[PDB]
Amino acid sequence: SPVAGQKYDYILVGGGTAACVLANRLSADGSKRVLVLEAGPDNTSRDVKIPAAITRLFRSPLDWNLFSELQEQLAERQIYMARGRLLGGSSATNATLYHRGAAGDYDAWGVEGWSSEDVLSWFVQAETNADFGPGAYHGSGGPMRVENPRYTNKQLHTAFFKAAEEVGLTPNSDFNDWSHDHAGYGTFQVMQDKGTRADMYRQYLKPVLGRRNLQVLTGAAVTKVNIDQAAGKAQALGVEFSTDGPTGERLSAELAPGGEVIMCAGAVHTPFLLKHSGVGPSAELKEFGIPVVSNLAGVGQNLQDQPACLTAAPVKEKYDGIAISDHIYNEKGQIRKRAIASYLLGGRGGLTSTGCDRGAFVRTAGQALPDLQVRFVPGMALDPDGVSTYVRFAKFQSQGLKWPSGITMQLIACRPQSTGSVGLKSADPFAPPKLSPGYLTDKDGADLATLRKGIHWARDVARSSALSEYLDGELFPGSGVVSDDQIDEYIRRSIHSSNAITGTCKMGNAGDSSSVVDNQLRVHGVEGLRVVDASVVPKIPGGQTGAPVVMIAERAAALLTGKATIGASAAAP
Ligand SMILES: Cc1cc2nc3c(=O)[nH]c(=O)nc-3n(C[C@H](O)[C@H](O)[C@H](O)COP(=O)(O)OP(=O)(O)OC[C@H]3O[C@@H](n4cnc5c(N)ncnc54)[C@H](O)[C@@H]3O)c2cc1C
Ligand SMILES: CCCCCCCCCCCCCCCCCC(=O)O
Ligand SMILES: CCCCCCCCCCCCCCCCC
């Protein structure tokens, strides 16, 4: 109806992080008709713009409200896995931390044309940094805004840094500088523009919405890719969607000749939509009567997510009032005047903060790269599940109660060995996917050992004189949790997502039978169909996954518009 009579050079499934970048670069020269289909609404919420409002976005109408299958290995629990549902996608709901990981993460992919040397210029092209000038590892004119966080806890941030030095960890002045080792303590940069969320809707899509060759539909739920098995190969025709929920008319958007469908529905929904389109393991598609168009074992396999647990500790009575919770709320749960004024006057203070933007990468046992990320928060968790405690914090407003002053250290397995999957529970494309994070399932128990040693690392730091000054005991996991078996059980009962999720449409070399896309991001066995989102990441880098997604989308845009090739090798003689 809004597409009837139209032919598109690109149809982007989803309007999230990658889709905003592609919509921008693919529509730039004016010759190509680009359509964006996003299930969620327009990006207008004040809770998106204010970083501390991340607390309100969890479990909100701007989230998918996805829950895993029951996890036997995690005390028989379903795990909440937050996912953005609006233009900008998860970039509009994330903790804004800016991480590329280490050079070793990209070289470990072992995919021709996607080495660390290959991807570095695509990170740099995307970047404008308020705190790092141009050089080997930083750019200065790209659409992303990156900056040092504009909130500092004067007592607790320096106490965390002094405590990390007292236990012998070295500082890392730039977690994105590949000329030195990834390990150390320091400050995480953030995807913010003077304390306002700089999501990819704001940085890439919103500025170009006036382009006549660019059509963006919201409230548009894609139900499948339309694929024709005519000539002698499967050919994408376009995509089916509803603008009116499960009961809506199935509309079809149509490709112009030479048109491509680009999957941008992210590491949960892209493999889900591919399976609904006939692209996936034939046995899974046959289960729900889906005709097999491309029998691809890898679709929805290799789900990688970075699992988290935490410690938390109150400050002494004499240090009541010094936590970020005291800077945001007064003793009655009223938003502080000073915080509102500092945010609105010059984009500073507690409302600029996502909480978890100082920390460390740590090797728990002589690994080639750090297995542990630490996120220090100068406020005290009231739940061992950090995401639950952020939801509690949002609901705390105006309750007339005092949030107790303290600290938290979240421990993340940042290069996990466990994998999970995404598949189908039902034939209905409006139904939640069958979601299995796979936390703590690796054969050697490596991921559990990382989180157990992380808790020992956080306890060592909290015991150090620098942080001991402020603290008065431990709330989580608490004095009942001491032996390795007690810690392991605390972890199983409290483990939560640090909200990565990659690898479900794994990019791979020729000869890699687990791959879903080639090094050109084309889906095996279909013409005019690509995946450009976190799905394609072969092996998850250390640290949060947003910046790698934007890099992949920048490089894919350059490839599709003929400004770059991928691979590399001279022809053999
Ligand atoms: C709570 C949270 C915290 C995070 N913290 C950080 C962090 O601090 N730093 C960071 O770098 N990364 C962070 N991440 C991860 C990062 O945000 C993601 O890896 C990245 O945004 C993924 O980009 P994407 O384009 O692959 O998918 P997304 O941005 O998730 O976009 C996919 C889009 O597809 C849409 N879609 C789904 N199904 C359909 C359908 N049927 N029809 C149409 N559209 C559909 C979705 O609604 C969504 O808008 C966080 C993630 C979350 C959720
Ligand atoms: C943890 C609780 C998060 C609280 C966040 C909401 C705080 C709102 C303060 C009052 C509104 C501030 C003025 C509106 C600013 C709009 C956002 C922006 O345009 O950058
Ligand atoms: C955005 C600032 C909110 C202040 C929160 C005060 C409590 C601190 C809790 C930290 C929770 C564990 C680690 C972070 C979880 C990230 C979702």
Swiss-Prot record:
pH curve summary: Optimum pH is 8.5 (with palmitate as substrate). Optimum pH is 6.0 (with octanoate as substrate).
Application in biotechnology: May be used in light-driven, bio-based production of hydrocarbons. The oleaginous yeast Yarrowia lipolytica expressing FAP from Chlorella variabilis under blue light conditions produces odd-numbered alkanes and alkenes, which could be used as drop-in biofuel.
Family: Belongs to the GMC oxidoreductase family.
PROSITE patterns in the record: GMC_OXRED_2
BP GO terms, sorted: glycine betaine biosynthetic process from choline
InterPro entries: FAD/NAD-bd_sf (IPR036188), GMC_OxRdtase (IPR012132), GMC_OxRdtase_N (IPR000172), GMC_OxRtase_C (IPR007867)
Group of enzyme by EC: lyase
Protein name, as recorded: Fatty acid photodecarboxylase, chloroplastic
Species: Chlorella variabilis
